[PDB]
Every structure is written in structure tokens, then in C-alpha cells.
Amino acid sequence: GRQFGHLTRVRHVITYSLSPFEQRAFPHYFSKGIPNVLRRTRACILRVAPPFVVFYLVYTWGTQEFEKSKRKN
């Protein structure tokens, strides 16, 4: 919660970091990150979008039933 210096007592950890000038900006953007983002899309949208196809069926079904009910002249 507070600033640095007290937070948690951790031993047994090494972290290797690199200066960014040795490394490129976009390593394999169109050959590894594209399968990564396709997998992350492919996981969740078949859980998130099926409420929206319920919304679109309510859209079409209620719209056509409303126009049938209100255009009986």
C-alpha cells in the first residue's frame, strides 16, 4: 500500500533485465503475436458473443413482430 522499502520479505529470487537499446521494438509481430492474439480471441468470444447473438435475435424477432402488429392498416 505504502511506498517502497517495507512491502514483503522475499528471498531466493533472481531477475534478469536487458537495456532496451540492444533489443528491437517489435520482435515477430506478424508471426508470433498474431497467433497469440488469435488464441486469446478464440478462447473468450464464444463465451462473450453468445449473449450478443441473443441480443441480435431479440433485435430481429421483436422488430418484425412489432412491425407486423403495428402495420395492420
Binding site: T8, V10, H12, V13, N36, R40
Partner: protein, 100 residues
């Protein structure tokens, strides 16, 4: 069994065997969860902070460790639950001793 197959399917779909986590790393912190975390063995606590730091760095880099490194379903060395049950029993003992 139907519900046990639901449990296996649910641990597969939960998605931290992908992240390399366990039972004792997904707990929300109330006061008593933090107290049971303070009541931990040394090697388990160091493994817990290393698994937390791995999951943090992975979910930053949004990469999932491959199929050879996933935590399987009943190999789990679950450990925080006895400390948690003791803390719940002591907390409920104290509160009911105030209730009486």
C-alpha cells in the same frame, strides 16, 4: 460421476493450470486470509511468492507456458487450508465468546 466430471472440466476451463498456479494462490485477502498467510512454512511461502511473481510476469507479457508445464488436476500439494480452518475456528471462538 457427473459433478466430478463437471469439476474436472471446470478446472480445465478456469485457466491457471495454463498460468502455472495452484489452490493456495487464488484467495482473496480479508484479515484472516492474511493471518493464515503469515502462518505459513518457509519453503511453502517462498514457493508461493515465486509462483505469484511468475503469474504476474506472465500475465504482463500475456504468454501462457506450454503444455509440458501445466499443473495437473490431483497432483496438487494443497497447503493453506488447515491454517485457514484453524484461523476461522479461533476467530469464531472469539466472536462467540463475545456473543455469550
Amino acid at each position: 460421476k457427473w459433478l466430478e466430471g463437471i469439476r474436472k472440466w471446470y478446472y480445465n476451463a478456469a485457466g491457471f493450470n495454463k498460468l502455472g498456479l495452484m489452490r493456495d494462490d487464488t484467495i482473496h485477502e480479508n484479515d484472516d486470509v492474511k493471518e493464515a498467510i503469515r502462518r505459513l512454512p518457509e519453503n511453502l511461502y517462498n514457493d508461493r511468492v515465486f509462483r505469484i511473481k511468475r503469474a504476474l510476469d506472465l500475465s504482463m507479457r500475456q504468454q501462457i507456458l506450454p503444455k509440458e508445464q501445466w499443473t495437473k488436476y490431483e497432483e496438487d500439494k494443497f497447503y493453506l487450508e488447515p491454517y485457514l480452518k484453524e484461523v476461522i475456528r479461533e476467530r469464531k471462538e472469539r466472536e462467540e465468546w463475545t456473543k455469550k
